[PDB]
Design goal:
It comes from Human rhinovirus 16 (HRV-16). The protein has about 450 residues and is of the alpha+beta class. It folds into three domains: about 190 residues, no CATH class; about 110 residues, Alpha-Beta Plaits; about 90 residues, Up-down Bundle (Mitochondrial Import Receptor Subunit Tom20, Chain A), CATH 1.20.960. It has 18 helices and 15 strands. The strands form five sheets. It has a five-stranded mixed sheet. Strands 10-11-7-12 form a four-stranded antiparallel sheet. Helix 10 crosses helix 12 and helix 14 runs antiparallel to helix 15. The chain binds a RNA duplex (32 and 14 nucleotides) through strand 4, strand 6, helix 7, helix 8 and helix 12.
Length: about 450
RNA sequence: AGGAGAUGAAAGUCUCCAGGUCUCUCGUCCGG
RNA sequence: GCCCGGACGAGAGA
């Protein structure tokens, strides 16, 4: 995250971009029944709740880059992770346009419901206008691709979500980086085969959790991290604190898999437009690009290997087991390591690592206090080899208070019941009861705790 | 400001639209 | 009924 250049769009022959300002979120019929502090993020400087300058708060996350270079440990990390991935036997060959657009085994189709990016967003062109899902006609898309070529600027948008109260006045809204459909397709065509293999193989070989079902995967994890010390921690602004050298690393891994290692320099050194400002950034993974999840994850796997090599002199990398989902990571070693000491080593690279789940200091962890993807671990009372993914009840209460689709609070409630019941019968009982304390809740179908339970057992 | 539409003979007026890459899960529907 | 395939929505997570 180093801003290199910053210009007015007109002085580069670029349009301004309409940036949305209204939230889709609104209070649900349960707004008053459950406790919660969260509210929609700030989307404009004219938000009354805002107690600071919005732009200065938005772009404050771009600091600079620490002075570091590659080194032998990073090169060892690359060598080791590269060796792992090769065992998967990934085809480095490109994929056909048809697969880039409509998907293939382990690659979803393009999202026809989201923006097409620059320049279509300034010309009233939607993805659906370029792609006819029902006839698979892509004549219009082919025409656009030729017309505007590639490496178009990503467009900065504000993410419309609930945030904690303390992110509202502070104006700490998360930003999104919109990839042009031209570029998404391009990255898919080159890297599709890699993305797919990752999607189809969550676990300790990909070093990646993307593509897992927590309800069934949670029982595999203690088998995959067979180790003695199990550990986890937190990144302060992971994506923007990625130094260009991790990108050189990622490239080296890609190269060892016989993929193209240069396209990703469009992520390291990226073009963006925010409203009427054109800018370019050196460093940081532009969350919103093609492959954010995979590339962020692959990178984490290098970092963690490097950090451990830095902190400990005689390590067995084969017994350092890692699973990552972007910035989120859980890992193990065969003996006990000092999380505190490892986190320290990230500092010289520009990484800020903190005790997992907002502790004040680093404490030991086991499958009792550790979490991944917001979920905890706890064994079934009947089958001790089956592990529940626990979910924070506070977040369930915050979630139910808001809705983006009033006419389907039923679907909403069902999604939460499937999260909640893993926490146990009596909390689930209480949840049901609170729901039915009002008329709207009693109108709703709610799955019985035992129905949920047995359905869970049948998946094993 | 751009796009789409409504209105008007026109001049004009009016209304709507815009928000990433993904994973899993649930609901509904059509299928083999 | 199970398995998979599509479509339309939603919720959570990164």
């Amino acid at each position: 995250g180093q801003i290199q250049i910053s210009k007015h769009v007109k002085d580069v022959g670029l349009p301004s971009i309409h940036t949305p300002t209204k939230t889709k979120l609104q209070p649900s019929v349960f707004y008053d029944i459950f406790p919660g502090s969260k509210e929609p993020a700030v989307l404009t400087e004219k938000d009354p709740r805002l107690k600071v300058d919005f732009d200065s708060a938005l772009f404050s996350k771009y600091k600079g880059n620490t002075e570091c270079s590659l080194n032998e440990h990073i090169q060892v990390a690359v060598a080791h992770y590269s060796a792992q991935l090769a065992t998967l036997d990934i085809d480095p060959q490109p994929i056909a346009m048809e697969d880039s657009v409509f998907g293939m085994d382990g690659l979803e189709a393009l999202d026809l419901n989201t923006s097409a990016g620059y320049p279509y967003v300034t010309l009233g062109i939607k993805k659906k206008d370029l792609i006819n899902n029902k006839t698979k006609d892509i004549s219009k898309l082919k025409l656009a691709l030729d017309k505007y070529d590639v490496d178009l600027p990503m467009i900065t948008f504000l993410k419309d979500e609930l945030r904690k109260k303390d992110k509202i006045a502070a104006g700490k809204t998360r930003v999104i980086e919109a990839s042009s459909i031209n570029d998404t397709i391009l990255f898919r065509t080159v890297y599709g085969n890699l993305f797919s293999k990752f999607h189809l193989n969550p676990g300790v070989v990909t070093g990646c959790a993307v593509g897992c079902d927590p309800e069934t995967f949670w029982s595999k994890i203690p088998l995959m991290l067979d180790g003695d010390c199990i550990m986890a921690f937190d990144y302060t602004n992971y994506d923007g604190s990625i130094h260009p050298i991790w990108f050189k690393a990622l490239g080296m891994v890609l190269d060892n898999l016989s993929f193209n290692p240069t396209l990703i320099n469009r992520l390291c050194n990226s073009k963006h437009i925010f409203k009427s400002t054109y800018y370019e950034v050196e460093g940081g993974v532009p969350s919103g690009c093609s492959g954010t999840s995979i590339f962020n994850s692959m990178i984490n796997n290098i970092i963690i290997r490097t950090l451990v090599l830095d902190a400990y002199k005689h390590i067995d990398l084969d017994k350092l087991k890692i699973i990552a989902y972007g910035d989120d990571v859980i890992f193990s070693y065969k003996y006990k390591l000092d999380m505190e000491a490892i986190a320290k080593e990230g500092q010289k690279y520009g990484l800020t690592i903190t005790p997992a789940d907002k502790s004040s200091e680093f404490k030991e962890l086991d499958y009792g206090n550790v979490t991944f993807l917001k979920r905890g671990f706890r064994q079934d009372d009947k089958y001790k080899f089956l592990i529940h993914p626990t979910f924070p009840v506070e977040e369930i209460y915050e979630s139910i208070r808001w809705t983006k689709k009033p006419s389907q609070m039923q679907e909403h409630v069902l999604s939460l019941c499937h999260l909640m019941w893993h926490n146990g019968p009596e909390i689930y009982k209480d949840f049901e009861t609170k729901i039915r304390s009002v008329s709207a809740g009693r109108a709703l179908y709610i799955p019985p705790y035992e129905l949920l339970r047995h359905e869970w057992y049948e998946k094993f």
